[PDB]
């Protein structure tokens, strides 16, 4: 009974690029897959792994900043919610 969401096109493209196959997800699944996108594309700092640099990537278009820490929860949840609809 978790809320189901339907990502908008750019978010869906990111999710499918890391092997998600569906069109509707829970918020925890969206977060998991975005994390995997960062990990697979090596967008994090090797020393302080919470730090992401996304300026030269579509992820930067999603979050609207060139860099962020994964501790920026308000920004991360807000930008994900701007990029989906509830089902
Ligand atoms: C010490 O290094 C860490 C510690 C925590 C995270 C993290 N933290 C998790 C997280 C972060 C923010 C929210 Cl709002 C929810 C979950 C989740 C995540 C989910 C979405 C995004 Cl956009 C980024 C990361 N997320 C992860 O995706 N992790 C967990 C740890 N290792 C991983 O391989 C993947 C982390 O993420 C990297 C991808 C940058 C690195």
Swiss-Prot record:
Region feature Necessary for interaction with USP2, mapped onto this chain: 1-87
Residues annotated as domain SWIB/MDM2: 3-86
Region (Sufficient to promote the mitochondrial pathway of apoptosis): 1-78
Induction: By DNA damage.
Connected disease: Seems to be amplified in certain tumors (including soft tissue sarcomas, osteosarcomas and gliomas). A higher frequency of splice variants lacking p53 binding domain sequences was found in late-stage and high-grade ovarian and bladder carcinomas. Four of the splice variants show loss of p53 binding.
Miscellaneous comment as given in the Swiss-Prot or TrEMBL entry: MDM2 RING finger mutations that failed to ubiquitinate p53 in vitro did not target p53 for degradation when expressed in cells.
Family assignment from sequence similarity: Belongs to the MDM2/MDM4 family.
Stated role: E3 ubiquitin-protein ligase that mediates ubiquitination of p53/TP53, leading to its degradation by the proteasome. Inhibits p53/TP53- and p73/TP73-mediated cell cycle arrest and apoptosis by binding its transcriptional activation domain. Also acts as a ubiquitin ligase E3 toward itself and ARRB1. Permits the nuclear export of p53/TP53. Promotes proteasome-dependent ubiquitin-independent degradation of retinoblastoma RB1 protein. Inhibits DAXX-mediated apoptosis by inducing its ubiquitination and degradation. Component of the TRIM28/KAP1-MDM2-p53/TP53 complex involved in stabilizing p53/TP53.
Quaternary structure note: Interacts with p53/TP53, TP73/p73, RBL5 and RP11. Binds specifically to RNA. Can interact with RB1, E1A-associated protein EP300 and the E2F1 transcription factor. Forms a ternary complex with p53/TP53 and WWOX. Interacts with CDKN2AIP, RFWD3, USP7, PYHIN1, and RBBP6. Interacts with ARRB1 and ARRB2. Interacts with PSMA3. Found in a trimeric complex with MDM2, MDM4 and USP2. Interacts with USP2 (via N-terminus and C-terminus). Interacts with MDM4. Part of a complex with MDM2, DAXX, RASSF1 and USP7. Part of a complex with DAXX, MDM2 and USP7. Interacts directly with DAXX and USP7.
Protein name (record): E3 ubiquitin-protein ligase Mdm2
Source organism of this protein record: Homo sapiens (Human)
Gene this protein is translated from: MDM2
Entire protein: shown range: 24 to 110 of 491
